[PDB]
Scaffold this motif. Structure first.
Motif, PDB file in Angstrom:
ATOM      1  N   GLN A  87       0.827  -1.201   0.000  1.00 32.52           N
ATOM      2  CA  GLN A  87       0.000   0.000   0.000  1.00 32.52           C
ATOM      3  C   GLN A  87       0.865   1.256   0.000  1.00 32.52           C
ATOM      4  O   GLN A  87       2.053   1.222   0.319  1.00 32.52           O
ATOM      5  CB  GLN A  87      -0.928   0.005   1.216  1.00 32.52           C
TER       6      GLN A  87
ATOM      7  N   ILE B 137      -1.623   1.374  -5.242  1.00 34.98           N
ATOM      8  CA  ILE B 137      -3.041   1.058  -5.128  1.00 34.98           C
ATOM      9  C   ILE B 137      -3.781   2.129  -4.332  1.00 34.98           C
ATOM     10  O   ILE B 137      -3.270   2.641  -3.336  1.00 34.98           O
ATOM     11  CB  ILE B 137      -3.261  -0.310  -4.455  1.00 34.98           C
ATOM     12  N   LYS B 138      -4.987   2.461  -4.777  1.00 34.22           N
ATOM     13  CA  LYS B 138      -5.801   3.468  -4.106  1.00 34.22           C
ATOM     14  C   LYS B 138      -7.267   3.048  -4.070  1.00 34.22           C
ATOM     15  O   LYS B 138      -7.857   2.734  -5.103  1.00 34.22           O
ATOM     16  CB  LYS B 138      -5.663   4.818  -4.813  1.00 34.22           C
ATOM     17  N   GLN B 139      -7.848   3.048  -2.875  1.00 37.66           N
ATOM     18  CA  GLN B 139      -9.246   2.668  -2.706  1.00 37.66           C
ATOM     19  C   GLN B 139     -10.142   3.453  -3.657  1.00 37.66           C
ATOM     20  O   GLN B 139     -10.686   2.901  -4.613  1.00 37.66           O
ATOM     21  CB  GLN B 139      -9.688   2.900  -1.260  1.00 37.66           C
TER      22      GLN B 139
END
Length: 49
Positions: free
Chosen positions: A7, A47-49
């Motif tokens: 992350q 990665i990004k929500q």
């Protein structure tokens, strides 16, 4: 083994970016070109929500 990607840890990154702040400049210049290369994989690496 090897270095793995996780992350978008800013807390851990900030530690390295602190001193890298100096080199960040020289990189910000050429970054103009890498901007397109990042979208190749760098975009997925983070990665990004």
């Amino acid at each position: 083994g090897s270095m793995k990607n996780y992350q978008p840890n800013k807390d851990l990154l900030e530690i390295l970016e602190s001193q890298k702040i100096k080199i960040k400049n020289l990189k910000e210049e050429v970054k103009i070109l890498q901007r397109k290369i990042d979208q190749q994989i760098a975009k997925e690496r983070v990665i990004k929500q």
